Amino acid sequence: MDEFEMIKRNTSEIISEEELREVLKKDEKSALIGFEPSGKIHLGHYLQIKKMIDLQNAGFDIIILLADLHAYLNQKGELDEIRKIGDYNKKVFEAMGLKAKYVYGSEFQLDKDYTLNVYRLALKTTLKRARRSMELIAREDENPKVAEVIYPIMQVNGCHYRGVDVAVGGMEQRKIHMLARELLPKKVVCIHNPVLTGLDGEGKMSSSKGNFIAVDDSPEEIRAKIKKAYCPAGVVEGNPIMEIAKYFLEYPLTIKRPEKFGGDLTVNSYEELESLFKNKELHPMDLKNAVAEELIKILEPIRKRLL
Numbered sequence: 001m002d003e004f005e006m007i008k009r010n011t012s013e014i015i016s017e018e019e020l021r022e023v024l025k026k027d028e029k030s031a032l033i034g035f036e037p038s039g040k041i042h043l044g045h046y047l048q049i050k051k052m053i054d055l056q057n058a059g060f061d062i063i064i065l066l067a068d069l070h071a072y073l074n075q076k077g078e079l080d081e082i083r084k085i086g087d088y089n090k091k092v093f094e095a096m097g098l099k100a101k102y103v104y105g106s107e108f109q110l111d112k113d114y115t116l117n118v119y120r121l122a123l124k125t126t127l128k129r130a131r132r133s134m135e136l137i138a139r140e141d142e143n144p145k146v147a148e149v150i151y152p153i154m155q156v157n158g159c160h161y162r163g164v165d166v167a168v169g170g171m172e173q174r175k176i177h178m179l180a181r182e183l184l185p186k187k188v189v190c191i192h193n194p195v196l197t198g199l200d201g202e203g204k205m206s207s208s209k210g211n212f213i214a215v216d217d218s219p220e221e222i223r224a225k226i227k228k229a230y231c232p233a234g235v236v237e238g239n240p241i242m243e244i245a246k247y248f249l250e251y252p253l254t255i256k257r258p259e260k261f262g263g264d265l266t267v268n269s270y271e272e273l274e275s276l277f278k279n280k281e282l283h284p285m286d287l288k289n290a291v292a293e294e295l296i297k298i299l300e301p302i303r304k305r306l307l
């Protein structure tokens, strides 16, 4: 529960833990995350929002960048409409219990000086490298657009927004974060969150891939996605259900299951759950039932708030 450790819990990485220590010591600390507005808000978003809440709980002021022109540059549609999706995403984040100030990229990302710095960065950023930073983010396009390489350098110019101490993102953001680390004068702590695996286990969870559990999915919908979900006995790596168990559920967890095979089993950490599953001592069916029911309970307040 040590702040540093609660912040670190379930992150992939923190560049750098030292700097982070330096930031925790300050009275005023602030942290930033940015999202291309998404028509559906899913566990991937929630993982990251959860982490912002940890930070908020550690006395950080939180900023949410509703990245409308990033979405525009990444071919998500017309600004006007991207904005209204963004405003919907705000509601959801508020429903998740975030206490944040919300900003649309467009509010400041088209300022003369902002673009002038974007063009300054474009001089120091190679095409090869900008392309490389967008592999995990760029909307698939057989004929890649100039917009693709503008996107990252605009992102980089926004990382220092309101002199934030810390920036948060999924691991797919890290090549762009690295560009920023290098190019920008003052360093901010990157905190990176892991990318959840799709329910079919085939890629990583995304809105455009339809392999996700949305935070306002119906319970019937949650049970069915999870029933359908890839979850091979003994395999944890690439198992989205394990992932959910690791990242969302409270412990101790009380996996109810028929006496016929074991009866109710009580586990005290995700690590205990891991070996039980590795052994093939907990069956995917039983795992799924416990996960689905706990998720439904977890997600219920948020679902509820959204009406």
Ligand SMILES: CC(=O)c1ccc(C[C@H](N)C(=O)O)cc1
Pocket: 033, 034, 035, 036, 065, 067, 070, 105, 137, 154, 155, 156, 157, 158, 159, 160, 173
């Ligand atoms: C700092 C900044 O401008 C920023 C903009 C957009 C994003 C969104 C992120 N690139 C995504 O894939 O959702 C993150 C940070």
